[PDB]
């Protein structure tokens, strides 16, 4: 069993830098490449194989490619501490940026590098034997992540087919944002993320900022803490594949028990307990309260209120000192609360996953070392209001044809703007009808 991850854009490979540091610290791989100790604890031998491939020996190269158009961050990765770990051929870097332009990175610049990305990922999959599926990281506000990501996912779909492609994207927050023309990129990314991504996990940046200011009490949080939280989420997500548990769940479990229809795949992420080191000592750690904290909107990774929507299906990943009895009791407790409701579509809208190894802690990080944790992935109808909220401010811009001359010059036209608007409206209608 193996999974290969591709990181698109400037933020994508920063998230990858956090994730791979966490993986190397968790699997005990020295950043030069080799494992000092051959003995293993917990998951057992051959555990590292799903992330690291046994190349020659004394090295374990990750099954990832960093692809980006601006060379500065890729060269910073090349020059930093992890020179020997990453292969020189996997850090794909372009020569000029896409410049927040979906058209530029989708028609002009992406065409010369997507072929190299594909013919490297082809041999990455060839080296594999039990590929569960792909999973991607990108931000739809940029040019490379939004523009090139669409083409890369389309070509991956046409080259492989029904293979799982988990989408961990980063949407612009409704109030706090960094760019100006990003509604165009986001909408033109949605028009293909609808039909190409198998499971899409939403991640707003302001929600994690609120989590850090509120829970971990770093009054000046930067992108590194956000990336570390994303890495913790992904690790708690793949711990079932990596290590042994009571009820292990693989990748093709999520699509079966969280996707009621092929065009409805949008997951709110949640994590518990996100607590500081000092708060960790006065607060008890048991399944009940960490499960309760996993459904509160104040600890969600996306700025939306699930109380305005109806839960369709939920997924619960457990780590550490967790046994079936107390998680069963906790999930029974949740169903009694009438504050949160489940759609009548699915009475048993729960799926639990239990692992035994507690999440690891990184020196310099802010999360505390805890006995247990919960990673929650659910499907509800707040995605409908999120999309319409972005749609309104996208339609504000297009009425005056602002910034449209940039896109048309690269080689696209204005028809796909209209069809993306119509696709978003149809998605809103679909979500509303499903909510009934």
């Amino acid at each position: 069993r193996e999974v290969i991850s591709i990181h698109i854009g400037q933020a994508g490979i920063q998230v990858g830098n956090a994730c791979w540091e966490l993986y190397c610290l968790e699997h005990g791989i020295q950043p030069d490449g080799q494992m000092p100790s051959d003995k293993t604890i917990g998951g057992g031998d051959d555990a590292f194989n799903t992330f690291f491939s046994e190349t020659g020996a004394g090295k374990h190269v990750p099954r990832c490619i960093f692809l980006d158009l601006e060379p500065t961050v890729v060269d910073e990765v090349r020059t930093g501490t992890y020179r020997q770990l990453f292969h020189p051929e996997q850090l794909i870097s372009g020569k000029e940026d896409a410049a927040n332009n979906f058209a530029r990175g989708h028609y002009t610049i992406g065409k010369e590098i997507v072929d190299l990305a594909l013919d490297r990922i082809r041999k990455l999959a060839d080296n594999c034997t039990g590929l569960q599926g792909f999973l991607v990281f990108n931000a739809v506000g940029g040019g490379t992540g939004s523009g090139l990501g669409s083409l890369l996912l389309e070509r991956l779909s046409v080259d492989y087919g029904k293979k799982s492609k988990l989408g961990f994207t980063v949407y612009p927050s409704p109030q706090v944002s960094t760019a100006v023309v990003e509604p165009y990129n986001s909408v033109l990314s949605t028009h293909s993320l609808l039909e190409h991504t198998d499971v899409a996990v939403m991640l707003d940046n302001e929600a994690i900022y609120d989590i850090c200011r509120r829970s971990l009490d770093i009054e000046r949080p930067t992108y590194t803490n956000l990336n570390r939280l994303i890495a913790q989420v992904i690790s708690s997500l793949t711990a079932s594949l990596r290590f042994d548990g009571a009820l292990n769940v693989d990748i093709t479990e999520f699509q079966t028990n969280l996707v009621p229809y092929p065009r409805i795949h949008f997951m709110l992420s949640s994590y518990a307990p996100i607590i500081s080191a000092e708060k960790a000592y006065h607060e008890q750690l048991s399944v009940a309260e960490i499960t309760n904290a996993a459904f509160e909107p104040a600890s969600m990774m996306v700025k939306c209120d699930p109380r305005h929507g109806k839960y369709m299906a939920c997924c619960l990943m457990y780590r550490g000192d967790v046994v079936p009895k107390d998680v069963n009791a906790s999930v029974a407790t949740i169903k009694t609360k009438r504050t949160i409701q489940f759609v009548d579509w699915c009475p048993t809208g729960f799926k639990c996953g239990i692992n035994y190894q507690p999440p690891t802690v990184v020196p310099g990080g802010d999360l505390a070392k805890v006995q247990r944790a919960v990673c929650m992935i659910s499907n509800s109808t707040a995605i409908g209001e999120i999309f319409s909220r972005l749609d309104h401010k996208f339609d504000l811009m297009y009425a005056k044809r602002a910034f449209v001359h940039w896109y048309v010059g690269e080689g696209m036209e204005e028809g796909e703007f209209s069809e993306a608007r119509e696709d978003l409206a149809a998605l809103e209608k679909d979500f509303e009808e499903v909510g009934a």
Partner: protein
């Protein structure tokens, strides 16, 4: 001479089989090495029913392991008695059904069913007189439910006269793991009601209830539930392996418990189960065995017997006991509580006696009662199934694999007229 072959399906089936083989290998006194180390000479004479003699006093279980994920092979060889199984019997694919009945019944089961069919045909013909097949599995997973019931069917058109046991656990809303449990469960029941000779219904909810209230354990993991299931599975087949005052083979219980061919769903109890705190207040008598055997809180199914009627019942007793006490206790329990037993079947209770108790015990009992209150759980599953199927939730994972909308409707209709048959037979008049 009378031979039972064992088939294990899925992760739950493999763990249940591991516990069952541990307890049976302890019963016949063979060490985890696989050689004989028992004390009594009565053990060696009747080990052919479960073990084949290999070499130098080494016996290998007559078992087949079947599932779709290597973690279960790692688990099987992790505990003791993990090096006694023959490696050729580990028929095994590696894709994983993934909680999908269609995957384990049409896509993955189709090509891997032939290897396990070869294994079971090779092992079943290696012995003289097959008593029947025994399978433990689940109705919630994909590699245990779909593949398991497809193998059930295949053996049924291959061997139509042999007996057939199915220790199957059915998911419950009280303790529900996955989302698509009714989708798999309804179709698995649809296949079982036509293929299996008789089904011995288990449930994790009742097992947790037993381990919490009666045993009063602190952390009842899956090990304790599998131990209870293994104790039941050892108690049911005690008569073949040991002499007794009144023997009872599997076919004898089947004919004494099944009045009509479609009424082959039983509920399970075991006796005795006492917490170590209450240990020094206990007595060792037949009355306290029948006192806990008939208790509604001891049933390993989530169906209250007092909500319906007892069509037929059976009790398997082990240990040096008096037939007179067993007969009079059965007569008293039949006559006093005279409203919970069906009227057009006099002498609803069948009994058997064995002389060899399970290891570490002096006396024991096992209950297998065909009641019409077992349709309570079928309705409880069908209501969720029709809640989901009314508006086609998660249907694309099944119809996008080869299945059609007709199969779901036929499964609903068959489950519905099965519960209707149980209800009509419950309210039937003797005149």
């Amino acid at each position: 001479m009378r031979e039972i072959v064992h088939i294990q399906g899925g992760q739950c089936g493999n763990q249940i089989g591991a516990k069952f083989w541990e307890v049976v290998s302890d019963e016949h006194g063979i060490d985890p090495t696989g050689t004989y180390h028992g004390d009594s000479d009565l053990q060696l004479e009747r080990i052919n029913v479960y073990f084949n003699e290999a070499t130098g006093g080494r016996y290998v279980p007559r078992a087949i392991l079947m599932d779709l994920e290597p973690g279960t092979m790692d688990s099987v060889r992790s505990g003791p008695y993990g090096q006694i199984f023959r490696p050729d019997n580990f028929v095994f694919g590696q894709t994983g059904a993934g909680n999908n009945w269609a995957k384990g019944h049409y896509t993955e089961g189709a090509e891997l069913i032939d290897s396990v069919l070869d294994v079971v045909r090779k092992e079943a013909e290696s012995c003289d007189c097959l008593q029947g097949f025994q399978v433990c599995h689940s109705l919630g997973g994909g590699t245990g439910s779909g593949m398991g019931t497809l193998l059930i069917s295949k053996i049924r058109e291959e061997y139509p006269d042999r007996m057939m046991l199915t220790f199957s656990v059915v998911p419950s809303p009280k303790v529900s793991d996955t989302v698509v449990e009714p989708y798999n469960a309804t179709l698995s029941v649809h296949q079982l009601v036509e293929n299996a000779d008789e089904c011995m219904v288990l449930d994790n909810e009742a097992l947790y209830d037993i381990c919490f209230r009666t045993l009063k354990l602190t952390t009842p993991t899956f090990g304790d539930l599998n131990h209870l299931i293994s104790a039941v599975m050892s108690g049911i087949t005690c008569c073949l392996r040991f002499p007794g005052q009144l023997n009872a083979d599997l076919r004898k219980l089947a004919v004494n418990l099944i009045p009509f061919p479609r009424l082959h769903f039983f509920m399970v109890g075991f006796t005795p189960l006492t917490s170590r705190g209450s240990q020094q207040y206990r007595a060792l008598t037949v009355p306290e065995l029948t006192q806990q055997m008939w208790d509604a809180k001891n049933m390993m199914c989530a169906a209250d017997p007092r909500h319906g009627r007892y069509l037929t019942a059976s009790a398997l007793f082990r240990g040096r006991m008096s037939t007179k006490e067993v007969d009079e206790q059965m007569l008293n329990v039949q006559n006093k509580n005279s409203s919970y037993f069906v009227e057009w079947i006099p002498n609803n209770v069948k009994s058997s006696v064995c002389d060899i108790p399970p290891k570490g015990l002096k006396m024991s009992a096992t209950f297998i009662g065909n009641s019409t209150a077992i349709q309570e759980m079928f309705k409880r599953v069908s209501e969720q199934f029709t809640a989901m199927f009314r508006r086609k939730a998660f249907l694309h994972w099944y119809t996008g694999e080869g299945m059609d909308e007709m199969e779901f409707t036929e499964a609903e209709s068959n489950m519905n007229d099965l519960v209707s048959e149980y209800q009509q037979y419950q309210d039937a008049s003797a005149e």
